[PDB]
Paper text:
Type 2 promoters contain two gene-internal DNA-binding elements named A- and B-box that are recognized by the general transcription factor IIIC (TFIIIC). The N-terminal moiety of [name] ([name]-NT) and subunit [name] heterodimerize through a triple β-barrel fold most similar to the dimerization domains of general transcription factor TFIIF [name]/[name], whereas the C-terminal DNA-binding domain of [name] ([name]-DBD) comprises a winged-helix domain most similar to the winged-helix domain present in TFIIF [name] that is packed against a second domain with novel fold.
Well-diffracting crystals were obtained for a Sfc11-110(K48A,Q49A)/Sfc71-101 construct, where two non-conserved [name] residues (K48 and Q49) were mutated into alanine following the suggestion of the surface entropy reduction prediction (SERp) server. The [name]-NT/[name] dimerization module consists of three interwoven β-barrels containing 15 β-strands and four α-helices. The interwoven structure suggests that the subunits fold co-operatively and need to be simultaneously expressed. The crystal structure also confirmed that the mutated residues K48 and Q49 lay at the surface of the [name] dimerization domain and do not interfere with [name]–[name] heterodimerization. According to program Dali, the structure shares the highest similarity with the TFIIF [name]/[name] dimerization domains. [name] and [name] resemble [name] and [name], respectively (Z-score = 9.3, rmsd154CA = 4.7 Å).
Numbering used by the authors:
A (entry chain A): 3 to 108
B (entry chain B): 7 to 10, 14 to 73, 80 to 100
Amino acid sequence: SLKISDNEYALIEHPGFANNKDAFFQTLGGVQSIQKACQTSFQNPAAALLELNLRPKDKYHHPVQARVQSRNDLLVTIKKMDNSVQNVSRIRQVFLFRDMADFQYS
Amino acid sequence: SLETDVENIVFQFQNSSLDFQSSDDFSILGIDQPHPIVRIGGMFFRGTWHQPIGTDIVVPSVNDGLVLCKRRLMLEQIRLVPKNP
Ligand SMILES: [Hg+2]
Ligand SMILES: [Hg+2]
C-alpha cells in the first residue's frame, strides 16, 4: 500500500490530437495560456476559464469555452518495470471539452 | 513546455462525490488485468479501461506538465459479497 500524496493537478480534456505538438498546444492559446489557465484554477477556482480553437484559419469556426468542474479524479504514476504504484495525486479541476455537442463522435 | 521510465494514468470514478483525500491509503490488485481492483481507504472499486477520443493534458499546481494519449481507468464502487453465507 501507499498513501495519496499532496500533489495536485488540473486536467484538460481535449478532443483532438497531439501529432503536431505546437499546433496542438496552440488550439488552447499556447503553452503559456495553458499554464495561466491552470494557475487561475488554483488561485481563484470560480474564475477558471479556457478557450479551444481547433480550426484557427477557418472563418466559420466558433471558438469554444470549456465547462470547468471538479470530480474526484486521481493521477496515478506507475513504474513501468514492475507495474508498482510510485505516486497518486488528486486532479482538483477539469476543463471539459470532450462530450460537448461540438465534438461528439461515434 | 509539457511532455508526451514511469507511466501516468488518470483514474475516473463513476461516483464523483466519493471523497479521496491525501493520506488516504491506496492499493491496486491487477493493474495489468482487464478489470483491476482498487482499494482506497475502506472502499473497493473495480476498474474498466476506456480510451477517450482525444488527449489529456495534466498540468501541475505548485508541488514539491504531461500529455496523455493512452487509456484511463473507469472505477465503480463494489461490495465484497460472500458467495456463500
Ligand atoms: Hg497550475
Ligand atoms: Hg495514444
